[PDB]
Amino acid sequence: CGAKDSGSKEKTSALSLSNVAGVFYILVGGLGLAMLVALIEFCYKSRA
Amino acid sequence: FLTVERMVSPIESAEDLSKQTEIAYGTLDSGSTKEFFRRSKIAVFDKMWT
Numbered sequence: 001c002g003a004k005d006s007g008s009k010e011k012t013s014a015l016s017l018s019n020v021a022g023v024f025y026i027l028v029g030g031l032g033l034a035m036l037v038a039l040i041e042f043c044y045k046s047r048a
Numbered sequence: 049f050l051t052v053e054r055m056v057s058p059i060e061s062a063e064d065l066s067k068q069t070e071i072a073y074g075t076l077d078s079g080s081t082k083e084f085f086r087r088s089k090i091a092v093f094d095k096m097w098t
C-alpha cells in the first residue's frame with residue numbers, strides 16, 4: 001500500500017494549485033479563443 | 049491563517065526519527081529502554097538502535 005501521506009502538510013499550509021486550477025484552464029481557454037477570434041477577423045478582412 | 053493557529057509536531061508518527069537526522073534522540077544509559085533497543089529485531093526499532 002502506498003497512500004502514506006507524510007512529510008510537509010499542505011493542510012497546515014497554502015492553497016495548492018489544485019484548488020484554483022480551474023482558473024488557469026479558463027484563462028488559457030480564453031487566450032486561445034482570443035487568438036482564434038483575431039485570426040478569423042484577419043482572415044475576413046484580408047484577401048481584399 | 050491569522051485566525052486558526054494549528055501547531056503540528058514534526059515527529060508525530062514516532063517513526064520519522066528513523067528517517068530524519070536533524071533531531072537527535074537518545075535514552076537513559078544502562079536502562080531497560082537501551083537494552084530493549086539493543087535486543088529488539090523490529091525493523092524500525094532496529095533502525096533506531098543502529
Ligand SMILES: N[C@@H](CCC(=O)O)C(=O)O
Pocket residue numbers: 079080081
Ligand atoms: N526505570 C525502569 C522502568 C523504565 C522507566 O523509567 O519508565 C527500568 O529501568 O526499566
